[PDB]
């Protein structure tokens, strides 16, 4: 895999039926992926690690997007992981604070890139769970649990640095 911004996909699939299994059991997976074509690949990869079930043995029954039913809320996601190291694999549990499960998943991947130089193919998302204000462990997130939350905007470095490339005025960063 790679990225861009992920979505959620509900893939479901079954080992396709034989004489010896006339109505095989469907399976479902929260895939997070930049598009349905890869979602489905990703689905298989996971299924096969779990069940004896390869793409050629099976079919994907229903792959489709899953939209955030609470977009305009802001939520704290816990999110459990299983990345790889330059050494051996680890598990983690990180927390993000976002408007959409996708958003938080993407916002995870990026972080893992930064904090651990973990590429996507290295990473497995095992669950993403919206959470209460409480239950949140990470004080990164918990500093945004406040009702009278206030902060200034301090050394507010200018952009538009080349609009006026040259000029009279030295700028001003206090706002």
């Amino acid at each position: 895999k790679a990225s861009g911004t992920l979505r959620e996909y509900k893939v479901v699939g079954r080992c396709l039926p034989t004489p010896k299994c006339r109505t095989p059991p469907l399976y479902r997976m929260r895939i997070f992926a930049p598009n349905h074509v890869v979602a489905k690949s990703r689905f298989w990869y996971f299924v096969s690690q779990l069940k004896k079930m390869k793409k050629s043995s099976g079919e994907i029954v229903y792959c489709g997007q899953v939209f955030e039913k609470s977009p305009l809320r802001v939520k704290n996601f816990g999110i459990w992981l299983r990345y790889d190291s330059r050494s051996g694999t680890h598990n983690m549990y990180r927390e993000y604070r976002d408007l959409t499960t996708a958003g938080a998943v993407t916002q995870c991947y990026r972080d893992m890139g930064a904090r651990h130089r973990a590429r996507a193919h290295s990473i497995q998302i095992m669950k993403v769970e919206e959470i209460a204000a409480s239950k949140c462990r990470r004080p990164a997130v918990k500093q945004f649990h406040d009702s009278k939350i206030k902060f200034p905007l301090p050394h507010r470095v200018l952009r538009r640095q080349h609009k006026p490339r040259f000029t009279t005025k030295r700028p001003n960063t206090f706002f």
């Binding site: 895999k1 598009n35 074509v37 690949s41 079919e59 029954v61 229903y62």
Partner: protein, 168 residues
């Protein structure tokens, strides 16, 4: 759940060029009529066709076209293969002349057969000359790798139309 049909027909594009190519690849690619880079064909899927399209995964991009994609290819870039000379399908009386035995008598009939994969698909399609597409406007994500891992190669099923737009 309505599991719909697996696709009958896919369009296939050689996306990488003609040096250093492995010997088994090259054979297959020339069975597909993809001897220049950026040529493309319609390929009726079936186990036999599919396993060939696997063996050239890294060289081709391919997928299941739209209807529109068929039209946009066939009107704009569709040339008959008539007495082995490549010939622009300017008028119907060229299609008919060579596929009339098959009840294919006009531009429209040819598309029909390509798109639905009728009985005569083999001979209608054969008769079309391998689609000399342009280089893709807006370029490619990565020529090397598979679609799924951020590239352009391999099967991208639906998306292949997006590519057909920028390259027709």
């Amino acid at each position: 759940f309505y599991v719909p049909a697996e696709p009958k027909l896919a369009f296939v594009i050689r996306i990488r060029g003609i040096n250093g190519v492995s010997p088994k690849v090259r054979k297959v690619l020339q069975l597909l009529r993809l001897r220049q880079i950026f040529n493309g064909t319609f390929v009726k899927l079936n186990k036999a066709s599919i396993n060939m399209l696997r063996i050239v995964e890294p060289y081709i991009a391919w997928g299941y076209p739209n209807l529109k994609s068929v039209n946009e290819l066939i009107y704009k870039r569709g040339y008959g293969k008539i007495n082995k000379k490549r010939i622009a399908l300017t008028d119907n009386a060229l299609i008919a002349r060579s596929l009339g035995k098959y009840g294919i008598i006009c531009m429209e009939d040819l598309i029909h057969e390509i798109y639905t994969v009728g009985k005569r698909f083999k001979e209608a399609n054969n008769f079309l000359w391998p689609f000399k597409l342009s280089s893709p406007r807006g370029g490619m994500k990565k020529k090397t790798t598979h679609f799924v891992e951020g590239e352009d190669a391999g099967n991208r099923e639906d998306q292949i139309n997006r590519l057909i737009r920028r390259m027709n």
